[PDB]
Structure formats: C-alpha cells, structure tokens
C-alpha cells in the first residue's frame, strides 16, 4: 500500500506574487503554469539536497545542503538577492537569511550591537575509548547503557570488592579518595544491582551513627546520598523509602556531640540535608505522597510547643528551602511566634546551653527568607519603619537585603 501524491504550491499564492509585481489580470491556466514549474524545482533540489545529507553522514537536512544543491544545478545559492552580472558574488553562499514568521520586522540598530556575542565552541579533538573488550561491551560513560544447589551471591567478587573499596573510601579517611569514590558513585553505569546494598549501608549507618552524633560520618553519608541521586543510569524511587527518613533524621535531630563550634557544620549538615530533601521532592513526585508528607511533618515539627532548638532550627531550614510559593503561603502567619521564642531566649540568662545559638541561627534564616518573600511581591516603598507592623524583626536591615537583591537583579 502506497498512496503517494504530487503536492504542489498553491496557485492562490502565485497570483498574489504576480499582482504585487505589476503583472495584473493573469488567467488561471497561466497561474497554474507557474506553480507546477516551481514546485518541480523545489522537488528537484530537495531530492538533490538529500544527496549531500547522505554524503555528509547526517540524518538532518541542514541549511547548507540546499546551498550546495543549488550550486550543483548552476543556480546561485543567494536567496535574498539576485545579481544579474553575477560578478560581485559568483556561486557564493551567504548562509541564508535569519528570518522568522513570528518576528518583529523592525529592530533598533543599537540593540544588535549591545547584545553579547555567542561563545565559539571547542575545536574538534580525537579521543579514543573501547567499544568491546574481547567481545564484551564495557560500562564506561562513552558507552550507552536431595540437597538444593549451593547458591551464589548476585554480585561478582570484582563487584563486591568494588563495593568494599567505595564504602571504605566514602567514610572519608582521605579526601581525594572520598572525592573519587563520590564521582565513581555519580557516574558508574553498572551501579544498579548493587544499589540495595548501598541504600542499606546508608540507612543503617545514619541510624547507628546518630546514637553518638558523629558529624563527619553523617556529612560523608549525605554526600554519598547526593552522589547517588545525580547518577542518571540507576532507578532510585524503589529505594527512596529508605533514603528519605535518613535525611529527615539529619535535619530534625538533636546533636549528641559538643553543642557549639561544629553547629556551623551542623547548619551545613542541615543545609546539605535540606538541599537533598527538596531535590527528592522535586523528583519522584506522584499525587499527594512524598512532598505533602514531608511538608506535613515539617509543619507539625514547627507548630509543636517547646521543641528542641536543634530540631527547631533544622525543621525551619527544611521548610525554608522548599521553593517560591511554599514560603509565600506557610511562613506568613507565624512571625509573632518566632519573635516570642527569640524574646524568651534573650530574657533567660542561661547562656551555657545551646538555646541562644539555635535562636540566633533560626532568626537569621527566617529574616533572609522574609526579605525576598517581600522583595518578590511588593514595591520597595517605605523600607524604614513599615516592617514594624511585622514586629520589627529585620526592619531596615531586611530593607538593605531587599536592596542588595534588587542590585543583583539589575546586574542580571
């Protein structure tokens, strides 16, 4: 079965061209005579431009194929103009005209000068790799993808040794070892079918690593989670039910080790955990299961009375990094409670506990989020004392942060 037809250009476009040139009162047989001649020349060239596509080993007819197909038929590749003498440009392609259907048809002559020129890409280089090693294709990134018998483990001993080396490097005794092992996790194509043992090693580790709050052990495991996520080959949402309660525990947990000093890292432990938490709510998303579940746990962590302030700071960070609208709709009705908590830490003399440090970190983070939440939905008018209607927390310093954001927008 082949219902191949012969499609020509419409004749009602050929009369428009003729009467816009000075040739009026053309017959229909005169006009049909134009549109079978030019529709043959388009068919003659597109069949001849397909020879250059095949010879150049491409599957896409580029714009230069018609320039050589025209030159082959002794017609000048010039499209915009036609030179009768032909001596200024002799069969020289000018690359066509960059024109559109939805164009503006008028530009300002200094708009084209002030725009930055595009980057000239890298020159052609010759890299070698291996498609086949004695018959087997390697999984390198240059490649696409009655007694019952004694059973064998589903991992090879080179794979099991690889797992042992990667896990003993990812506990961060040496930093270069970690970084390679993290890149190895980030781009090994054959790291599926080992992924249950990695997920179990992560999950089990954090739970027996928060019994004593060992921050490095945790910072290395969170970097291992981040290296597991950006690998494009492996299928992760079968294992995310073990991954997510591990990161929530890094963010919402108390620190058994020295309260101050590494709290700076603790904020980053909660910074790395809140980053990977909102990356996990960005991926793996179905209706009303993952993002809303962690949002509900974060909100009941917040509205809980008389929290641990480490848990409070971590949950505050976690709800803070959830995007544009989430702070637009959630952090709004709660400023008074935040201020009251800050006032209590301030009044009670107790300084040797971690409450004061937790309070300062929470207030700074909340104030930065409130700044753009404001820069985003209102003009920057009355930035001096109008914020005193919102208990006067960040006030003029919040206004200065909004001004810095406006300066960054101007730079953009």
């Amino acid at each position: 079965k082949l219902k191949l037809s012969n499609t020509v250009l419409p004749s009602e476009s050929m009369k428009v061209v003729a009467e816009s040139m000075g040739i009026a009162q053309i017959q229909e047989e005169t006009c049909q005579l134009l549109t079978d001649e030019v529709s043959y020349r388009i068919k003659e060239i597109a069949q001849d431009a397909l020879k250059f596509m095949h010879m150049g080993k491409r599957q896409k007819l580029t714009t230069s194929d018609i320039d050589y197909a025209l030159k082959l038929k002794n017609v000048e590749p010039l499209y915009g103009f036609h030179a009768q003498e032909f001596i200024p440009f002799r069969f020289a392609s000018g690359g066509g005209r960059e024109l559109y259907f939805y164009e503006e048809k008028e530009v300002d002559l200094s708009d084209i000068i002030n725009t930055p020129l595009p980057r000239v890409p890298l020159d052609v280089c010759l890299k070698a790799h291996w498609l086949s090693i004695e018959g087997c294709q390697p999984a390198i990134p240059e490649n696409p993808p009655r007694l019952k018998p004694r059973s064998i483990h589903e991992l090879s001993v080179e794979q099991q040794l690889y797992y042992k080396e990667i896990t003993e490097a990812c506990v961060g005794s040496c930093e270069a070892k970690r970084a390679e092992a993290l890149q190895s996790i980030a781009t090994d194509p054959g790291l599926y079918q080992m992924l249950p043992r990695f997920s179990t090693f992560i999950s089990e580790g954090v739970r027996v690593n928060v019994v004593q709050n060992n921050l490095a052990l945790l910072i290395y495991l969170m970097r291992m989670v981040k290296a597991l996520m950006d690998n494009p080959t492996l299928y992760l949402e079968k294992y995310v039910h073990e991954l997510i309660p591990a990161v929530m525990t890094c963010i919402v947990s108390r620190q058994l080790c020295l309260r101050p000093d590494v709290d700076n890292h603790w904020a980053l432990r909660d910074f790395a955990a809140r980053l990977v938490a909102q990356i996990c709510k960005h991926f793996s998303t179905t209706t009303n299961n993952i993002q809303s579940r962690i949002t509900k746990t974060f909100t009941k962590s917040w509205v809980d009375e008389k929290t641990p302030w480490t848990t409070r700071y971590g949950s505050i960070a976690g709800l803070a990094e959830l995007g544009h609208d989430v702070i637009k709709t959630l952090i709004l009705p709660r400023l008074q409670q935040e201020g009251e908590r800050i006032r209590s830490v301030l009044d009670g003399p107790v300084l040797s506990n971690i409450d004061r440090i937790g309070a300062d970190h929470v207030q700074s983070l909340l104030l930065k989020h409130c700044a753009p939440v404001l820069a985003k939905l209102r003009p920057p008018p009355d930035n001096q004392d109008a914020y005193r209607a919102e208990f006067g927390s960040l006030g003029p310093l919040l206004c200065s942060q909004v001004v810095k954001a406006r300066a960054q927008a101007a730079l953009q």
Binding site: R207, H241, E242, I244, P245, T249, V252, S284, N289, T297
Partner: peptide
C-alpha cells in the same frame, strides 16, 4: 490504574515517617 507499578513502590505504601529518629535514646 491501581495496578500501575508506582502504587506498589514502598515509598507510597509504607509509613516511613515512623523511622525518622527524633531525640533518640
């Protein structure tokens, strides 16, 4: 549509919130 593979992935079928360790001891 309730036989879709996702319904059976254990993120959508497990109360994994209970695992998060809060103030453990």
């Amino acid at each position: 549509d309730l036989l879709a593979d996702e319904n059976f992935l254990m993120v959508t079928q497990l109360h994994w919130e209970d695992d998060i360790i809060w103030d453990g001891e």
